[PDB]
Design a protein around this ligand. Sequence first.
Ligand SMILES: C=CC1=C(C)/C(=C/c2[nH]c(/C=C3N=C(/C=C4\NC(=O)[C@@H](C)\C4=C/C)C(C)=C\3CCC(=O)O)c(CCC(=O)O)c2C)NC1=O
Ligand SMILES: C=CC1=C(C)/C(=C/c2[nH]c(/C=C3N=C(/C=C4\NC(=O)[C@@H](C)\C4=C/C)C(C)=C\3CCC(=O)O)c(CCC(=O)O)c2C)NC1=O
Lengths: 482, 482
Amino acid sequence: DLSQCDREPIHLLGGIQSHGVLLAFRGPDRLLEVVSANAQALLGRPPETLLGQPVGRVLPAEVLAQWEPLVARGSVRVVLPAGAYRALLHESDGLTVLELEPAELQPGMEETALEVVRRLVSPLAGVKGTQALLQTAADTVRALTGFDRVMVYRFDADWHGEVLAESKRGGMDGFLGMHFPATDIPVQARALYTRNPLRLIADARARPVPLLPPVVPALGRPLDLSNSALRSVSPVHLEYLRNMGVGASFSLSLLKEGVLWGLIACHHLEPLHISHERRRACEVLTQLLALQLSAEERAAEASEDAHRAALLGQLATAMGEGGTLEEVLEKESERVLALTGAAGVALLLGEEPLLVGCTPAQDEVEALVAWLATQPFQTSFHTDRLGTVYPPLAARADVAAGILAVRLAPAAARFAIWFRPEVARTISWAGNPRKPAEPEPGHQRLHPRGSFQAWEETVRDTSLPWKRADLGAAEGFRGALV
Amino acid sequence: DLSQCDREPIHLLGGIQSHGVLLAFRGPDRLLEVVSANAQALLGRPPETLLGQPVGRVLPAEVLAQWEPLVARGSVRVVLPAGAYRALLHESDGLTVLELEPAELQPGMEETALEVVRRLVSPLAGVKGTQALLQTAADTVRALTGFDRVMVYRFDADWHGEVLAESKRGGMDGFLGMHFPATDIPVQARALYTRNPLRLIADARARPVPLLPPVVPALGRPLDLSNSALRSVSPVHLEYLRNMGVGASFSLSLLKEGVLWGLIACHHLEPLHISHERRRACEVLTQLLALQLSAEERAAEASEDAHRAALLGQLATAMGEGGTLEEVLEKESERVLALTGAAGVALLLGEEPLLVGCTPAQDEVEALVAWLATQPFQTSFHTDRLGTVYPPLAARADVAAGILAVRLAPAAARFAIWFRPEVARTISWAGNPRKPAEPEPGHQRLHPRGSFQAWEETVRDTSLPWKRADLGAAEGFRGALV
Ligand SMILES: C=CC1=C(C)/C(=C/c2[nH]c(/C=C3N=C(/C=C4\NC(=O)[C@@H](C)\C4=C/C)C(C)=C\3CCC(=O)O)c(CCC(=O)O)c2C)NC1=O
Ligand SMILES: C=CC1=C(C)/C(=C/c2[nH]c(/C=C3N=C(/C=C4\NC(=O)[C@@H](C)\C4=C/C)C(C)=C\3CCC(=O)O)c(CCC(=O)O)c2C)NC1=O
């Protein structure tokens, strides 16, 4: 991939966060093969002395007492001299991996979680826009977590993102409405965050605890920490958080029909650890949000489709009525433009173009037609920045920044072309997107950018996007023109 | 017709169930106005002596201590000498109504409930049919409640219902696939269950506890118990449960888009109390099922619409390619029938009725064509039981149990008419639906039927129902033809 940013093997860094301990066992005897260097902080004896020992000799009695429920269901609460810990089991590189993390301290956590679950699963959740849906998701994640700032971050189609909603405590910086470069979350991280939907950075200023030995002996590379709850994250991201002034970070993947739609991102000014069970309660919330957004969005498309079909039905009724085609198309101009949310339409029915509403002049349309006929499309063609692909009209963003053309005949030049003007857009980036990172001389060590202050950009020469309903309506109009 | 069943005022029966206590207070001194006759077991004094007393002198300190969160939140847990009770507050008839019932005793209840909530969100529940979505909902409610039998009951358009899914104890009888008369849940019950979505019948053999006095003195009728958790239900429904052999019953209304879609109904063979907290956890599951059903239904309808529009788009290509309409329509014969899932179609392009596939004879179609013009519809007409509306073809259920017609011109009678044959359906009723009740001589006392054994009816002369995708595709074909 492109940058060095994509290259970092973030699952193979060999470090865990200092609040927990990791032990990896293999074979029928469960011999300890990999252990974190801090494992005396919970186990009494120096970790290097425990490599190669059977599990029954390294683990405390309190954990061994819970060994059967641990293996059975992969997660158990254990009470140690150092306090209550959550034990977690997964498999990686042929090893059984055991992680221990401080356990939830509030007995009423699940009751509180079930209550905020109600606030989001309730019907009527969305009855002032999906914006109120996102705001409620952010508010309830903040209530359950205690984090200073909770943001809903949506990926655009180039994988840069923007903050759509935000819940933060009074008197605190926010990022609402700002855009962030795709490189802020590089492609291997997005990959990992698609299969591992949660991640906690409990203290952005702490140093990672290394694993011992620093490679798995059979493999000659570090233990694969893809599914580790304790995995220490990229040093470059830790720098990024410090540059933002955040001491703890917790984010959750928003998966909507298989793809990474966005994130719920949380920041705290100070270190803060959330328990495993509290993180899993937060993940229920995000899966509810994904579900509410799908149902709302499909309802919106259906309503839009119904509106287009009503327009088509009225056009059909006006046909099969009086006069010629050009006459009914004259009377029904506003419906024909409304079909695709357009400001003008060129109808090429054989003679000269029929120009309805706001369109470029006849000579320019006939020229556009000559060129569309050569293009490699089948029934529909659309673009929201015509000037990039057809520079003869690149100056005419006022009437022809976007077009939608349907072919009305097989091997002949018969078309309906709808036009849209540009819509200027003011983007506010969190820092200068032209310098998304700060490499050292030589370009071997990368740093995050230093500032996230607003940096404004205006986008010109692009129309509103051609949406699914526009495309469906154009096909319906084609079928009516035969 | 408003039988005896529909007129019983089930919210004004004046009784509560024996496992709880109800008090109602009025005015700023909160004087006791109504009280259940069993209240000595909680108040220490005979209830008649407490009427007219201020709340501060009827309620133990334990309840008064929590008055403000009770008023703000509507429920609190209070620990009394008898044990832990849930206190529930609402307003009725200008009185403050207090209800007390035994509280949840399992500390881990909310943690278990959060675990079954995850089952119903998961990645994508219902990947193998909404049938498995309904099953998972019955299974999780049964797991959370411990009821012997849990059933998903859907209302049909005539408000009779059928059991679509069932989760039950081993060796238990069931009602899967069976149909029940609409009078089993009469119209005022359906109305109440739209407003109050939960109801528990903890012991179907127990007798109701009367309220004291039997009327609200200001009003001259019983206290309105619409929103009471302890309300004793209709005596004829208690007889219905006993005829079924059930000792306890619990049901949740399924509201999908504001309308009563169905019920999750639970039966226990012995008496069984479920706490308020546990009932509210079940309500989360039902609102989750409703949300899942809407998301999947909207997806299925979008997918069907997409198929119909592909069919129309192939019809458009074919017409813009060939000469004769009747030739293209002949060549494309089965796409034209697939449009509405039909077995024949009559195309009235003026001259001779063109008949494709499986249709009535030319004389017979010209007959219903003449009848169709003088009917009150603008663009489309459809029925799935043509014989009951147009007797000349009642004997032709083999080709024309259902029709769908669109008008291809305003004045004059140019139509396209799709035809469907009957589909015979075998439905099993729970008891003979001709005797849905057993009235006594004089027809003033009604009883429910005594038997629920399968009673089998085959429905004839009706097609598969015309769906919204069918109507949509026909409208699109109309636009392609005028
Ligand atoms: C409000 C907007 C907002 C945004 C847009 C935001 C970004 C964000 N980045 C990450 C993670 C990573 N970033 C990078 C690399 C680079 N980042 C750069 O700028 C350049 C210099 C670069 C490389 C050259 C890597 C390798 C990882 C994976 C770390 C790991 O998992 O090991 C995360 C998830 C972790 C978390 O929740 O804190 C988030 C949420 N956090 C916010 O709040
Ligand atoms: C497997 C399928 C299945 C069905 C289809 C089913 C029916 C059902 N009925 C009810 C309630 C009532 N029924 C009646 C009246 C009559 N019932 C008759 O038969 C005739 C004689 C009649 C009048 C002449 C009234 C007034 C009420 C309101 C009671 C109240 O709230 O006060 C309920 C809710 C309560 C609950 O979950 O147990 C259910 C779930 N219960 C099942 O499991």
